[PDB]
Amino acid sequence: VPDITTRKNVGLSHDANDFTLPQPLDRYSAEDHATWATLYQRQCKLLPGRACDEFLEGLERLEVDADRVPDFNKLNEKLMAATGWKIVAVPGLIPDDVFFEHLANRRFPVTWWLREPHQLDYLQEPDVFHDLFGHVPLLINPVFADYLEAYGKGGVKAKALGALPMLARLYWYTVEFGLINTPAGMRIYGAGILSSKSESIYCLDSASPNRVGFDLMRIMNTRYRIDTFQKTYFVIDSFKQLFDATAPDFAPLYLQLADAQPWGAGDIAPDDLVL
Ligand SMILES: [Fe+3]
């Protein structure tokens, strides 16, 4: 049983070093554009009062197509002038070192293909709607864009054994599933939540999960689960705080956490500050 990444990339090559390729525009059907249109309108009706304001405005400022899979090159004209970043198409999942290298150079990899109609909510493997709709708009906030860039640079430098899981955890709990407390109430900045119907509602509506204040060392030592609703969400007060977190060189931090047993995705640590 071949995964969608394989079926979608048949007859398509990718750079051996950075896994990029020109966006294969001819490969989007009429149905894919309708699938995109459906995803897009469904999220936009859920996000008011949910997504943080920066996300909403980035969507507006970049003019992410509402009715068809965006043309990466066109979007880049705006994204580059506004933030200094560009998106590059990748075939699907790429190696971490290649991913860190892109972020370090203000390139955001985006899986080019779209989920098939039979699918629809945060399926196995991220796709263009998740990657583009969920990740790209926030780059409109210069501090969050600076955070991503610093995160990639730290990744390029990481050597210590155990560092990769720690950085995967940090990325997951901020970039993919992060929440942000605002004067108007708790909001969302995580891509894995913003491109998902179910997660968008759950992360702000459920009594079950823990909602914990951002804490760097705690996060890097916290497991996460892939196919279920998150059991813990980490909350930042501002993007600056997120950026400031990348200020220290992480080298000694990996060594400190290296032998620690990690927290379960559902645990509450002694030093947590919980909602
Ligand atoms: Fe993602």
Distance 215 CA to ligand 1 centre (A): 21
Question: Around ion ligand 1, which residues have CB less than 5 A away?
Answer: 126, 191
Distance 86 CA to ligand 1 centre (A): 16
Distance 192 CA to ligand 1 centre (A): 5
The answer to whether 63 is annotated as binding is: no
Of the candidates 128, 102, 165, 164, the one whose C-alpha atom is nearest the C-alpha of residue 40 is 128
77: CB partners within 8 A, 6+ apart = none
Q: How far is CA 132 from CA 11, 125, 197, 254, in A?
A: 23, 14, 15, 31
Distance 80 CA to ligand 1 centre (A): 20
Distance 194 CA to ligand 1 centre (A): 10
Distance 72 CA to ligand 1 centre (A): 17
The answer to whether 176 is annotated as binding is: yes
> 3-state SS of the chain?
CCCHHHHHCCCCCCCCCCCCECCCHHHCCHHHHHHHHHHHHHHHHHCCCCECHHHHHHHHHHCCCCCCCCCHHHHHHHHHHHHCCEEEEECCCCCHHHHHHHHHCCEEEEECCCCCCCCCCCCCCCCHHHHHHHHCHHHHCHHHHHHHHHHHHHHHHCCCCCHHHHHHHHHHHHHHCCEEEECCEEEECCHHHHCCHHHHHHHHHCCCCEEEECCHHHHHCECCCCCCCCCEEEEECCHHHHHHHCCCCCHHHHHHHCCCCCECCCCCCCCCCEC
Distance 173 CA to ligand 1 centre (A): 11
Q: Helix 30-46 vs helix 197-205: angle between axes, to the nearest 10 degrees?
A: 10
Q: How far is CA 233 from the centre of its chain?
A: 14
Q: How far is CA 244 from the centre of its chain?
A: 19
Distance 200 CA to ligand 1 centre (A): 14
Q: Domains of the chain, with CATH numbers?
A: 1-275 (1.10.800.10)
CA distance 235 to 202: 15
Distance 138 CA to ligand 1 centre (A): 13
Distance 170 CA to ligand 1 centre (A): 13
The answer to whether 57 is annotated as binding is: no
Q: Helix 163-171 vs helix 142-157: angle between axes, to the nearest 10 degrees?
A: 170
Q: How far is CA 236 from CA 55, 56, 144, 168, 271, in A?
A: 15, 18, 12, 18, 16
Task: State the Cα torsion 134-88-148-45 to the nearest 10°.
Answer: -10
Distance 176 CA to ligand 1 centre (A): 5
Here the tokens at position 184 are: 């108007």
Cα angle: 175, vertex 180, 183; to 5 degrees = 155
